[PDB]
RNA sequence: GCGCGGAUAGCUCAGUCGGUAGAGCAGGGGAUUGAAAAUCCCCGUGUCCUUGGUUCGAUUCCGAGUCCGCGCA
RNA sequence: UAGUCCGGAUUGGAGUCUGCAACUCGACUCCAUGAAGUCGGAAUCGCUAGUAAUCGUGGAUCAGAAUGCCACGGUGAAUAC
RNA sequence: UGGGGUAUCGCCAAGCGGUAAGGCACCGGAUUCUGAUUCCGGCAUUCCGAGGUUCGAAUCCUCGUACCCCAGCCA
RNA sequence: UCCUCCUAAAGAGUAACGGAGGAGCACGAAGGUUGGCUAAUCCUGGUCGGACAUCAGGAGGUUAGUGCAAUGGCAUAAGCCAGCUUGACUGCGAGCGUGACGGCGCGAGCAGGUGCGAAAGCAGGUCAUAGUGAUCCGGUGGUUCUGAAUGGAAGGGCCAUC
RNA sequence: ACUUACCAACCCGAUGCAAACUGCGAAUACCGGAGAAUGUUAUCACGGGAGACACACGGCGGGUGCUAACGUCCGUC
RNA sequence: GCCUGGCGGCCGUAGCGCGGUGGUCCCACCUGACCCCAUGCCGAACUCAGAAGUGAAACGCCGUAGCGCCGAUGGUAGUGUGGGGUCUCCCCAUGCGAGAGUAGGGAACUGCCAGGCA
């Protein structure tokens, strides 16, 4: 599980998730798993999907996780009233918008990249698509 | 002024001959000679730094400037602005007189003298050496020493490269093993 | 230089066993007897016996 | 805190006093300040670090 | 462990550009010298900039550091 | 840099005199000349200028660039400035110490009637 | 199901920035003794529960399991 | 009255002898070096008169190797209610 | 989970911001036929781990760890 | 209770048992002025000297510093060093800001007297924003302002102050 | 002094994130000035009388909550 | 007209870096220091008396875009008002309209005074 090594403040406000994404082209690799839905992704979903990919295209290839969590999500325990402070940091999410290339892959044929990205897009909560490295 | 005159004829002429300078002023000249004695054991004793100051007062012909600590560091048990060394900036006539006594009578009185290292340039020609005894200067009375106190000399010159400082200093014959 | 805070720096005459009579300014305040000078010190013979 | 209150009294015949605060521990010496005396209308020496 | 904040100090620009002032009027109550004093403007002890002559407030950008002066045009 | 150090020494009094709005007598000392010029309160335009590079001053001097030369220049700026209706200036020493020949120049300008 | 403490030599247990596996007892060899006990010295083929992964290298770090025990609306 | 002209350990250099052979691993000499040690904690030992103490000399073993052992003499006590 | 306390030589336990004190033990000597007792000498913890304030931290502050004590209620 | 940032929606203000930190002082120089100076860190060379105490040179640019939080400032330095000093003055104050009010804040200039500077000038505390407590009651010093027949006094007032 | 499947500072190239980051920066809002039309002075000051200081939902911007609540706390309509 | 010095406007299309050049005057380094003055040591700096020497450094000027810097058009984001949906987010009409990036521009421009040369 991914999590920043050392923050600056422990608890972040909710804020909103509007507009489109910045990481949009397949930059590092050759094939990409790009988001279409909005959503947000916990570190467990990123790890689950990465294991599905790494298993699927065996220890050949090279995989880039282009998103990183760095946003702490706090929850209140059970049978605790409202108020009395902000909750506790339970997990860490990345906020996703439509357009984020969530993962990249290189060093495989396209048909294995289809296969691993299908296998791993079923571990994520957002609708997802397959993209290739377009040249300009 | 003996080595200053010797400079003004034969070292200027000699270095204009060796290196193919155009300007007569492009030649290296020695700017200053700083004598530091960074005592450091004066964290507990003040008369020890006073005796150090008397020794640099004897070796050069000037009062030294008792230097203070720039930062506080705990590795050596000091504090900000605590007096920890003393130095004399010799320049002008006294630079040449001290340089004459140094290369003439002080350097040969070094114990087990093999020569001064030629790789003691800081890249910009400026020599720096260290003596381990203050006894090697003929002024320091051998019967009046209490602590052995070396010091470090630094010849600062206007040469750009350090081979150019090899040339400048070596034209005073300045031993160079 | 300032006034009298500096030690008295008067010209003296040093003389070693090499016959090198050499007058210099030094704040000893006394004439000087030496053995080794820059002239006739075993520096080059010293390096030779070192390597040899 | 530790820093006490003192009266700088005038050296002229008036009773006029300025008032201020002194660290009594680190500076035990008395405090003399040539302040302005508005009864004499003149800058007079003031004394009495209490 | 939290739950405290100071009282709001009501800083900022009190008279804007072109706004006619009397002498003595505070123009920018502020905290450092975010705005510097220009012609006919004084800077108080807490870096309050006040109209030293009558006229109109003139915000400008001068000098090699692109500082934000405040002049007053005589009017 | 020596020149840049001098300018940053000058700057406070320069900007203060531009803030007050006083006509300033800017001096300028060089190892063989002294220069003196009276500048309007807008700072752009000069009014009066004398210096030792002018042959009207330089011919009657032994050496341009000592205290006698500077006293001659101060006398000249005071004379020309009184001829052009300027009476009360403020002395901009322009980064030099008010000690040597800038003191000689300014004293000479005060003897010959220029009010500062 | 959740929160914990355990699995290291035949036995009973130690063991944190990852560095060639530790102790006591047991067992074996030697010294000693008439002989033995005792005492002293020497000696460990331990998948450090299984299995993957990280590292040059894992008892030790991460991921997932097996068994034992303690507690829980 | 000093760690000193005490003390001689240790160490460097230069040697002599014996012995096929002195590196491990001799003895002695010369020059240089010059530690520790200033009368020894608890405790403990020997001695009753030519004794203890102290000073030298010899011998056996042995090519060479004793501060040990076995002998020999010189000076020579104290104390025992 | 909150509040309080403790962590200092092998063990129990003192430490005042400028130095680490005690007892038992352990090591060496002595007494003793030998061991225990006894007697004479010693040693000894850079102070739980990390960061900070200070010229300077065992000492002060903050965080983590490990162990104790008190509370965790009315419905 | 008070200070700083965010929430706070680009003027001000703006809530919650919202997220984070600090204050209840220090200073007679750490204030005033005049004159001067410019950091951190790293590299190289150099007696003891070491990763890091002093020296010299270079790179670097304020990543430094600002008596103490944070923000905004600061090179003309508000940072650092030295000389002389008491403006850390007294009476006022055009005009403003800010509060329901009590109150709080900024202030050119006027008068008297002063410091620094050759002078222009600057100085009514500190780079700024925290470092605090109304009234009553009472204590101390000054001032005939009052002073229950009258002259005093007591007490009260006023100014300073605890 | 000799080797090395391990990690990795700084620097450079490329990629993201930030309420308490900003070498950039709107719309809107706000303040000020001028001008026309319209509005039963709608504005300000002073004086008499109040009431009210439990708000609710709905849009938009947010905090908290689980972007849960016909939840809670603000800003604005 | 060219060059240099001073004081400004302007505040990176103006600054950096690399390369070339200048000294008759100017400027800078320089020469000396007992004096005016100065160094918590030192004429290094400050200051004074000068002018032998060099333009080496510095500074100015001329080139050079390696970088910094400026920067459209178009599109995108956002957003005021009105409306709509599948409504934690978007769409429509309409008004405003970036930041980044691209083409490109780009090694400044200028006022007063003074001196030297033609
Ligand atoms: K064992
Ligand atoms: Mg077992
Ligand atoms: Mg166990």
Coordinates of N, CA and C in Angstrom, one line a residue, chain A:
Chain A
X1 N 0.8 -1.2 0.0 CA 0.0 0.0 0.0 C 0.9 1.3 0.0
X2 N 0.4 2.2 -0.8 CA 1.1 3.4 -1.0 C 0.5 4.4 -0.1
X3 N 1.3 5.3 0.3 CA 1.0 6.4 1.4 C 2.2 7.2 1.4
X4 N 2.0 8.5 1.5 CA 3.2 9.4 1.6 C 4.0 9.2 2.9
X5 N 5.3 9.2 2.7 CA 6.3 8.8 3.8 C 6.2 9.7 5.0
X6 N 5.7 10.9 4.8 CA 5.8 12.0 5.7 C 5.0 13.1 5.2
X7 N 4.0 13.5 5.9 CA 3.0 14.5 5.4 C 3.5 15.9 5.9
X8 N 2.6 16.9 5.8 CA 2.8 18.1 6.5 C 1.7 18.4 7.5
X9 N 0.5 18.0 7.2 CA -0.6 18.0 8.1 C -1.4 16.7 8.0
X10 N -1.8 16.1 9.2 CA -2.4 14.8 9.2 C -3.8 14.6 8.6
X11 N -4.6 15.7 8.7 CA -6.0 15.6 8.3 C -6.3 16.7 7.3
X12 N -7.0 16.4 6.2 CA -7.2 17.2 5.0 C -8.7 17.4 5.0
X13 N -9.2 18.6 4.5 CA -10.6 18.8 4.3 C -11.1 17.9 3.2
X14 N -12.5 17.7 3.0 CA -13.0 16.9 1.9 C -12.6 17.5 0.6
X15 N -13.1 18.7 0.4 CA -13.0 19.3 -0.9 C -13.8 18.6 -1.9
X16 N -13.7 19.0 -3.2 CA -14.6 18.4 -4.2 C -13.7 17.9 -5.3
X17 N -14.3 17.1 -6.2 CA -13.5 16.5 -7.3 C -14.1 17.0 -8.6
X18 N -13.8 18.1 -9.1 CA -14.4 18.6 -10.3 C -13.4 18.7 -11.4
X19 N -13.9 18.8 -12.6 CA -13.2 19.1 -13.8 C -12.5 17.9 -14.3
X20 N -11.7 18.1 -15.3 CA -11.0 17.0 -16.1 C -9.6 16.8 -15.5
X21 N -8.9 15.8 -16.0 CA -7.6 15.4 -15.5 C -6.4 16.1 -16.2
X22 N -5.2 15.9 -15.5 CA -4.0 16.5 -16.1 C -3.1 15.4 -16.8
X23 N -2.9 14.3 -16.1 CA -2.2 13.2 -16.7 C -3.1 12.5 -17.7
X24 N -2.9 12.8 -19.0 CA -3.9 12.3 -20.0 C -3.2 11.5 -21.1
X25 N -2.0 11.8 -21.5 CA -1.4 10.9 -22.5 C -0.6 9.8 -21.8
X26 N -0.5 8.7 -22.5 CA 0.4 7.6 -22.1 C 1.9 8.1 -22.3
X27 N 2.5 8.5 -21.2 CA 3.7 9.2 -21.2 C 5.0 8.3 -21.1
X28 N 5.0 7.5 -20.1 CA 6.2 6.6 -19.9 C 6.2 5.3 -20.7
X29 N 5.1 4.7 -20.7 CA 5.0 3.4 -21.3 C 4.5 3.4 -22.8
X30 N 3.8 2.3 -23.1 CA 3.2 2.2 -24.4 C 1.8 2.0 -24.4
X31 N 1.2 1.4 -23.4 CA -0.2 1.1 -23.3 C -0.7 1.7 -21.9
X32 N -1.9 2.1 -21.8 CA -2.4 2.8 -20.7 C -3.8 2.4 -20.3
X33 N -4.0 2.4 -19.0 CA -5.3 2.2 -18.4 C -5.8 3.6 -17.9
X34 N -6.7 4.2 -18.6 CA -7.2 5.5 -18.5 C -8.5 5.5 -17.8
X35 N -8.8 6.4 -16.9 CA -10.1 6.6 -16.2 C -11.1 7.3 -17.1
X36 N -12.3 6.9 -17.0 CA -13.4 7.6 -17.6 C -14.4 8.1 -16.5
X37 N -14.6 7.3 -15.5 CA -15.4 7.8 -14.4 C -14.6 8.7 -13.5
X38 N -15.3 9.4 -12.6 CA -14.8 10.3 -11.7 C -14.2 9.6 -10.4
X39 N -15.0 9.2 -9.5 CA -14.5 8.5 -8.4 C -13.2 8.9 -7.6
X40 N -12.8 8.1 -6.6 CA -11.6 8.2 -6.0 C -11.1 6.7 -5.6
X41 N -9.8 6.6 -5.5 CA -9.1 5.3 -5.5 C -8.3 5.1 -4.2
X42 N -8.6 4.1 -3.4 CA -7.9 3.9 -2.2 C -6.6 3.3 -2.5
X43 N -5.7 3.1 -1.6 CA -4.4 2.5 -1.8 C -4.6 1.0 -2.0
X44 N -5.6 0.4 -1.4 CA -5.9 -1.0 -1.5 C -6.4 -1.4 -2.9
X45 N -7.1 -0.5 -3.6 CA -7.5 -0.7 -4.9 C -6.4 -0.6 -5.9
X46 N -5.5 0.3 -5.6 CA -4.3 0.5 -6.5 C -3.4 -0.7 -6.3
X47 N -3.2 -1.2 -5.1 CA -2.4 -2.4 -4.9 C -3.0 -3.6 -5.5
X48 N -4.3 -3.8 -5.3 CA -5.1 -5.0 -5.8 C -5.0 -5.0 -7.4
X49 N -5.2 -3.8 -8.0 CA -5.1 -3.8 -9.4 C -3.7 -4.0 -9.9
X50 N -2.7 -3.5 -9.2 CA -1.3 -3.7 -9.6 C -0.9 -5.2 -9.5
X51 N -1.4 -5.9 -8.5 CA -1.1 -7.3 -8.4 C -1.8 -8.1 -9.5
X52 N -3.0 -7.7 -9.9 CA -3.7 -8.4 -11.0 C -2.8 -8.2 -12.3
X53 N -2.3 -7.0 -12.5 CA -1.5 -6.7 -13.7 C -0.2 -7.5 -13.7
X54 N 0.6 -7.4 -12.6 CA 1.9 -8.0 -12.4 C 1.7 -9.5 -12.5
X55 N 0.7 -10.1 -12.0 CA 0.5 -11.5 -12.2 C 0.2 -11.8 -13.6
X56 N -0.6 -11.0 -14.2 CA -1.2 -11.3 -15.5 C -0.3 -11.3 -16.7
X57 N 0.8 -10.5 -16.6 CA 1.7 -10.3 -17.8 C 3.1 -10.7 -17.5
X58 N 3.3 -11.8 -16.9 CA 4.2 -12.1 -15.8 C 5.3 -11.2 -15.5
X59 N 6.3 -11.6 -14.7 CA 7.4 -10.7 -14.3 C 8.2 -10.1 -15.5
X60 N 7.8 -10.4 -16.8 CA 8.2 -9.5 -17.9 C 7.5 -8.1 -17.8
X61 N 7.7 -7.3 -18.9 CA 7.0 -6.0 -18.9 C 7.6 -5.0 -17.9
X62 N 7.0 -3.8 -17.9 CA 7.3 -2.7 -17.0 C 6.0 -1.9 -16.7
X63 N 5.7 -1.7 -15.5 CA 4.4 -1.1 -15.1 C 4.6 0.1 -14.3
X64 N 4.0 1.2 -14.7 CA 4.0 2.5 -14.0 C 2.7 2.8 -13.4
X65 N 2.7 3.0 -12.1 CA 1.5 3.5 -11.4 C 1.5 5.0 -11.5
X66 N 0.8 5.6 -12.4 CA 0.8 7.0 -12.6 C 0.0 7.8 -11.5
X67 N -0.8 7.2 -10.7 CA -1.5 8.0 -9.6 C -1.0 7.6 -8.3
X68 N -1.1 8.4 -7.3 CA -0.6 8.2 -6.0 C -1.6 8.7 -5.1
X69 N -1.9 8.1 -3.9 CA -2.9 8.5 -3.0 C -2.8 9.9 -2.4
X70 N -1.8 10.1 -1.5 CA -1.7 11.4 -0.8 C -2.8 12.2 -0.4
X71 N -3.9 11.6 0.0 CA -5.1 12.4 0.6 C -5.7 11.6 1.7
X72 N -5.6 12.0 2.9 CA -6.0 11.1 4.0 C -7.5 11.2 4.3
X73 N -8.1 10.1 4.4 CA -9.5 10.0 4.7 C -9.8 9.6 6.1
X74 N -10.5 10.4 6.9 CA -10.8 10.1 8.2 C -12.2 9.6 8.4
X75 N -12.3 8.6 9.3 CA -13.6 8.1 9.7 C -13.8 8.1 11.2
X76 N -15.0 8.3 11.7 CA -15.4 8.1 13.1 C -15.7 6.7 13.4
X77 N -15.3 6.3 14.6 CA -15.6 4.9 15.0 C -17.1 4.6 15.1
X78 N -17.5 3.4 15.5 CA -18.9 3.1 15.6 C -19.3 3.4 17.0
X79 N -20.6 3.8 17.1 CA -21.2 4.3 18.4 C -20.5 5.4 19.0
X80 N -20.1 6.3 18.1 CA -19.5 7.6 18.5 C -20.5 8.7 18.0
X81 N -20.8 9.7 18.8 CA -21.7 10.8 18.4 C -21.1 11.6 17.4
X82 N -21.8 12.6 16.8 CA -21.3 13.6 16.0 C -20.6 14.7 16.8
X83 N -19.7 15.4 16.2 CA -18.9 16.3 17.0 C -17.7 15.8 17.6
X84 N -17.2 16.6 18.6 CA -16.1 16.1 19.4 C -14.8 15.9 18.6
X85 N -14.6 16.7 17.6 CA -13.4 16.6 16.8 C -13.6 16.0 15.4
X86 N -12.5 16.1 14.6 CA -12.5 15.4 13.4 C -12.1 13.9 13.6
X87 N -12.5 13.0 12.8 CA -12.3 11.6 13.0 C -10.8 11.2 13.0
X88 N -10.5 9.9 12.6 CA -9.1 9.4 12.5 C -8.8 9.0 11.1
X89 N -7.5 9.1 10.8 CA -7.1 8.8 9.4 C -7.1 7.3 9.2
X90 N -8.0 6.8 8.4 CA -8.2 5.4 8.2 C -7.4 4.9 6.9
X91 N -7.7 5.5 5.8 CA -6.9 5.3 4.6 C -6.6 6.5 3.8
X92 N -6.1 6.2 2.6 CA -5.6 7.3 1.8 C -6.1 7.1 0.4
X93 N -6.6 8.1 -0.3 CA -7.1 7.9 -1.5 C -6.4 8.7 -2.5
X94 N -6.5 8.5 -3.8 CA -6.2 9.4 -4.8 C -7.5 9.9 -5.4
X95 N -7.7 11.2 -5.6 CA -8.9 11.7 -6.4 C -8.7 11.6 -7.9
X96 N -9.6 10.9 -8.6 CA -9.5 10.7 -10.0 C -10.6 11.5 -10.7
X97 N -10.2 12.0 -11.9 CA -11.2 12.7 -12.8 C -11.1 12.0 -14.1
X98 N -12.1 12.3 -15.0 CA -12.0 11.7 -16.3 C -10.9 12.1 -17.1
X99 N -10.0 11.2 -17.4 CA -8.9 11.5 -18.3 C -7.6 10.9 -17.6
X100 N -7.6 10.5 -16.3 CA -6.3 10.1 -15.7 C -5.9 8.9 -16.3
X101 N -4.7 8.8 -16.8 CA -4.1 7.5 -17.1 C -3.7 6.9 -15.7
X102 N -4.4 5.9 -15.3 CA -4.1 5.3 -14.0 C -2.9 4.5 -14.1
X103 N -2.8 3.7 -15.1 CA -1.5 2.8 -15.2 C -1.0 2.8 -16.5
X104 N 0.3 2.5 -16.6 CA 1.0 2.3 -17.9 C 1.7 1.0 -17.9
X105 N 2.0 0.5 -19.1 CA 2.6 -0.8 -19.3 C 3.4 -0.7 -20.6
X106 N 4.6 -1.3 -20.6 CA 5.4 -1.4 -21.7 C 6.2 -2.7 -21.7
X107 N 6.5 -3.2 -22.9 CA 7.3 -4.4 -23.0 C 6.6 -5.7 -23.2
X108 N 5.3 -5.6 -23.6 CA 4.4 -6.7 -23.8 C 3.8 -6.5 -25.2
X109 N 3.1 -7.5 -25.7 CA 2.2 -7.3 -26.8 C 0.9 -6.6 -26.3
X110 N 0.2 -6.0 -27.3 CA -1.0 -5.2 -27.0 C -2.1 -6.2 -26.4
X111 N -2.1 -7.4 -26.8 CA -3.2 -8.3 -26.4 C -3.0 -8.7 -24.9
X112 N -1.8 -8.9 -24.5 CA -1.6 -9.0 -23.0 C -1.9 -7.7 -22.2
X113 N -1.6 -6.6 -22.8 CA -2.0 -5.3 -22.2 C -3.5 -5.2 -22.0
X114 N -4.3 -5.6 -23.1 CA -5.7 -5.7 -23.0 C -6.1 -6.7 -21.9
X115 N -5.4 -7.8 -21.8 CA -5.8 -8.8 -20.8 C -5.5 -8.3 -19.4
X116 N -4.3 -7.9 -19.1 CA -4.0 -7.4 -17.7 C -4.8 -6.1 -17.4
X117 N -5.1 -5.3 -18.3 CA -5.9 -4.1 -18.0 C -7.4 -4.5 -17.8
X118 N -7.9 -5.5 -18.4 CA -9.2 -6.0 -18.1 C -9.2 -6.7 -16.7
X119 N -8.1 -7.4 -16.4 CA -8.1 -8.2 -15.2 C -8.0 -7.2 -14.0
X120 N -7.3 -6.1 -14.2 CA -7.1 -5.1 -13.1 C -8.1 -4.0 -13.1
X121 N -8.8 -3.7 -14.1 CA -9.9 -2.7 -14.1 C -11.2 -3.2 -13.4
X122 N -11.2 -4.5 -13.0 CA -12.3 -5.1 -12.3 C -12.0 -5.1 -10.8
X123 N -10.9 -4.4 -10.4 CA -10.6 -4.2 -9.0 C -10.8 -2.8 -8.5
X124 N -11.1 -1.9 -9.4 CA -11.2 -0.4 -9.3 C -12.7 -0.1 -9.3
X125 N -13.1 1.0 -8.6 CA -14.5 1.4 -8.7 C -14.9 2.3 -9.8
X126 N -14.0 2.7 -10.7 CA -14.4 3.7 -11.8 C -14.4 3.0 -13.1
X127 N -15.3 3.5 -14.0 CA -15.3 3.0 -15.4 C -14.0 3.5 -16.0
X128 N -13.4 2.6 -16.8 CA -12.0 2.7 -17.2 C -12.0 2.3 -18.7
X129 N -10.9 2.7 -19.3 CA -10.7 2.4 -20.7 C -9.3 2.1 -21.0
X130 N -9.0 1.6 -22.2 CA -7.7 1.3 -22.6 C -7.2 2.3 -23.7
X131 N -6.0 2.9 -23.5 CA -5.4 3.8 -24.4 C -4.1 3.4 -24.8
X132 N -3.6 3.9 -26.0 CA -2.3 3.6 -26.5 C -1.4 4.9 -26.5
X133 N -0.2 4.8 -26.7 CA 0.7 5.9 -26.8 C 0.6 6.5 -28.2
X134 N -0.1 7.6 -28.2 CA -0.3 8.4 -29.5 C 0.9 9.4 -29.6
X135 N 1.3 9.6 -30.8 CA 2.4 10.4 -31.1 C 2.0 11.8 -31.5
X136 N 2.1 12.8 -30.6 CA 1.5 14.2 -30.7 C 0.0 14.3 -31.0

